[PDB]
Amino acid sequence: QGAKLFSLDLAALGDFEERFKGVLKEIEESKTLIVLFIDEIHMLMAANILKPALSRGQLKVIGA
Amino acid sequence: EYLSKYAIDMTEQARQGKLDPVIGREEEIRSTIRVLARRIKSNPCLIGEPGIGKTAIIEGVAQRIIDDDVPTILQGAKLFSLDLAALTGDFEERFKGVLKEIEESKTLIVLFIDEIHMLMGDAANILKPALSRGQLKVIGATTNNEYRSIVEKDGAFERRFQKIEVAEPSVRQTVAILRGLQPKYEIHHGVRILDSALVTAAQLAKRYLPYRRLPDSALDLVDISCAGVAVARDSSMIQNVVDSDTISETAARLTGIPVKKLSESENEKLIHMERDLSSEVVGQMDAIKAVSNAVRLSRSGLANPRQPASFLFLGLSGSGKTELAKKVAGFLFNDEDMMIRVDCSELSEKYAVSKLLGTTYDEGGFLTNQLQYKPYSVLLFDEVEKAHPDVLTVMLQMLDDGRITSGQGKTIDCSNCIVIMTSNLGAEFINSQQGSKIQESTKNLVMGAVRQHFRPEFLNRISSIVIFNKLSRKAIHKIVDIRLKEIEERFEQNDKHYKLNLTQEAKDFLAKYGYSDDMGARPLNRLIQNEILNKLALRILKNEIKDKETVNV
Numbered sequence: 290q291g292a293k294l295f296s297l298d299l300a301a302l303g304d305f306e307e308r309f310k311g312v313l314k315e316i317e318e319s320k321t322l323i324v325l326f327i328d329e330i331h332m333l334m335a336a337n338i339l340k341p342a343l344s345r346g347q348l349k350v351i352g353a
Numbered sequence: 354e355y356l357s358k359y360a361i362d363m364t365e366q367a368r369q370g371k372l373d374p375v376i377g378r379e380e381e382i383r384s385t386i387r388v389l390a391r392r393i394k395s396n397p398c399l400i401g402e403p404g405i406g407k408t409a410i411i412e413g414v415a416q417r418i419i420d421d422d423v424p425t426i427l428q429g430a431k432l433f434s435l436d437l438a439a440l441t442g443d444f445e446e447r448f449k450g451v452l453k454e455i456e457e458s459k460t461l462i463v464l465f466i467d468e469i470h471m472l473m474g475d476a477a478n479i480l481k482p483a484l485s486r487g488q489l490k491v492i493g494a495t496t497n498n499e500y501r502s503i504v505e506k507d508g509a510f511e512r513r514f515q516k517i518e519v520a521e522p523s524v525r526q527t528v529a530i531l532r533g534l535q536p537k538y539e540i541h542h543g544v545r546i547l548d549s550a551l552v553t554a555a556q557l558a559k560r561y562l563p564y565r566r567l568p569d570s571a572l573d574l575v576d577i578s579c580a581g582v583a584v585a586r587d588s589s590m591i592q593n594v595v596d597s598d599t600i601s602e603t604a605a606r607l608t609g610i611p612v613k614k615l616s617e618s619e620n621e622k623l624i625h626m627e628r629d630l631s632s633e634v635v636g637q638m639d640a641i642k643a644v645s646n647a648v649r650l651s652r653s654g655l656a657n658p659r660q661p662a663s664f665l666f667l668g669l670s671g672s673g674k675t676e677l678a679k680k681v682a683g684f685l686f687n688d689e690d691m692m693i694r695v696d697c698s699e700l701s702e703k704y705a706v707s708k709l710l711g712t713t714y715d716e717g718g719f720l721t722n723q724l725q726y727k728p729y730s731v732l733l734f735d736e737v738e739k740a741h742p743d744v745l746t747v748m749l750q751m752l753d754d755g756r757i758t759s760g761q762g763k764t765i766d767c768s769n770c771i772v773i774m775t776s777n778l779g780a781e782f783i784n785s786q787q788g789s790k791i792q793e794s795t796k797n798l799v800m801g802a803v804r805q806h807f808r809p810e811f812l813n814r815i816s817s818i819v820i821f822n823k824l825s826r827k828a829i830h831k832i833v834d835i836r837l838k839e840i841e842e843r844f845e846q847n848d849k850h851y852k853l854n855l856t857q858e859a860k861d862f863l864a865k866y867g868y869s870d871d872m873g874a875r876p877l878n879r880l881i882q883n884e885i886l887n888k889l890a891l892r893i894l895k896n897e898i899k900d901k902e903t904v905n906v
């Protein structure tokens with residue numbers, strides 16, 4: 290319930306990606322108050338995508 | 354006539370006896386004297402930590418001067434002490450003509466300049482030609498830092514100069530030089546000092562004081578303490594003074610728990626620390642012993658005075674491992690800030706700043722700066738081998754000695770600090786411990802695994818390395834029940850006044866569901882909020898279920 294939809298359509302455009310990593314706190318700010326959905330981009334990211342926030346045990350995401 | 358202007362002879366004050374007697378330095382002095390006696394490179398210098406008693410030597414110098422402990426050649430010489438400042442015309446001139454005066458003045462003194470030794474922009478040669486005169490006996494010093502930058506550029510600076518170690522005592526002799534205090538410094542503010550109030554301030558300020566210097570930091574608090582014992586006494590019969598009051602009390606100023614400062618120092622702490630760990634985490638009796646059992650070894654000087662306390666931990670974050678030291682530190686250093694974070698994700702090359710560096714904003718780094726900030730510390734290493742060859746090599750000094758040069762090249766003691774490695778190197782082998790191996794074989798499997806990423810020096814200098822292995826629900830529910838304990842003791846105490854209920858649901862859920870095998874109850878740790886704290890507070894926050902009430906799912 291308390292979660293809502295976020296879906297990151299990745300536009301990456303110094304590392305310009307860590308933004309995508311910094312937001313992992315911004316949702317962690319909300320404290321799983323949303324969900325993430327990524328569509329066909331699932332690949333090695335920087336480095337690997339995602340998890341350290343999910344791998345923190347947290348972070349419901351809609352994978353695809 | 355500019356003689357006395359910023360140049361104030363303190364051999365005056367030494368002839369006046371204004372200056373402050375201390376012990377032993379003749380060693381540096383006689384040399385630094387003998388240095389001052391050198392045609393070739395005249396100028397003795399102390400290179401390193403400020404506040405280490407530089408002109409205190411000059412005192413002794415001036416003392417040896419006025420005592421005629423000043424040796425033959427230079428007995429004529431004395432020291433005008435410069436006062437480094439002026440008003441802008443500009444400054445240099447005033448600071449120059451003197452230079453002429455004094456060598457002209459025929460060596461009745463020498464000059465000491467302390468840490469302020471200038472790379473000027475308009476550098477040109479400031480005092481340097483005067484210094485360069487083949488004449489003009491002077492005394493400079495600085496920390497290593499400027500000594501790094503400025504004096505190494507020429508290096509015929511040394512052709513004038515001589516470096517000498519800024520003399521930092523032993524504690525015992527610091528204690529001893531402050532043991533000479535007890536008959537004398539008992540009565541400064543008009544009391545007596547016990548053997549109790551005597552050595553500990555050191556032992557404390559050593560162990561407990563972040564900043565100041567061995568006799569300095571030690572001698573500091575006791576008069577900082579006298580707010581009570583000097584003023585409230587004559588404001589009643591206290592003659593002798595005691596450690597705690599003088600110290601631990603006045604030590605508890607910063608934090609507290611003088612009992613842990615006092616009633617137990619390291620002695621019992623260890624003695625039961627095993628279960629004390631087990632208190633925080635049941636399970637992993639291995640490291641419950643080992644690291645503990647080990648780090649017990651860490652102290653007492655079984656081995657190198659210079660020597661770190663070092664471990665890799667293995668398991669699933671949210672196994673309590675990353676915590677674990679925070680107990681230990683809280684258990685030992687009575688803090689969780691002792692724990693300090695080294696992200697091996699972050700590590701490639703450029704980190705050499707982020708610890709600390711000789712600054713070229715590229716400025717003071719952090720991590721070493723943090724122990725430099727936090728002289729008692731615990732160092733956590735975030736999936737170690739994920740770091741580059743960058744740190745692991747500097748980790749040698751960490752592997753070494755329990756002491757660390759900052760990136761400006763300033764050593765700080767980790768033999769009083771902790772360093773702890775994280776890695777997944779047995780993750781699959783955690784999965785082997787999920788099959789619950791003879792841990793040896795799988796630790797061997799790990800050992801080989803961990804063996805790979807590192808030169809043995811890395812591998813060898815570790816105090817040891819331990820797995821935090823498969824965690825039976827035994828621990829879980831306990832840990833959970835411990836996990837239970839943390840929030841309730843935050844709140845019913847003050848906030849929530851809260852009496853509690855537990856369905857076995859949650860009791861089972863949190864253990865069963867809330868705990869993840871792989872990702873742990875680590876999320877459940879957050880979930881414990883969510884399905885419980887978040888849930889039941891939300892249940893209660895209405896208040897219709899009253900304060901101190903409880904409803905579990």
Ligand SMILES: Nc1ncnc2c1ncn2[C@@H]1O[C@H](COP(=O)(O)OP(=O)(O)NP(=O)(O)O)[C@@H](O)[C@H]1O
Pocket residue numbers: 345633634635669670671672673674675676677824828832836873874875878
């Ligand atoms: N076996 C355990 N004993 C005690 N606390 C545990 C245990 N397993 C997980 N925890 C909790 O999980 C955290 C500690 O997990 P730990 O194994 O130290 O790795 P961690 O890095 O701290 N988890 P995290 O820091 O979010 O990655 C703390 O919140 C503990 O309360």
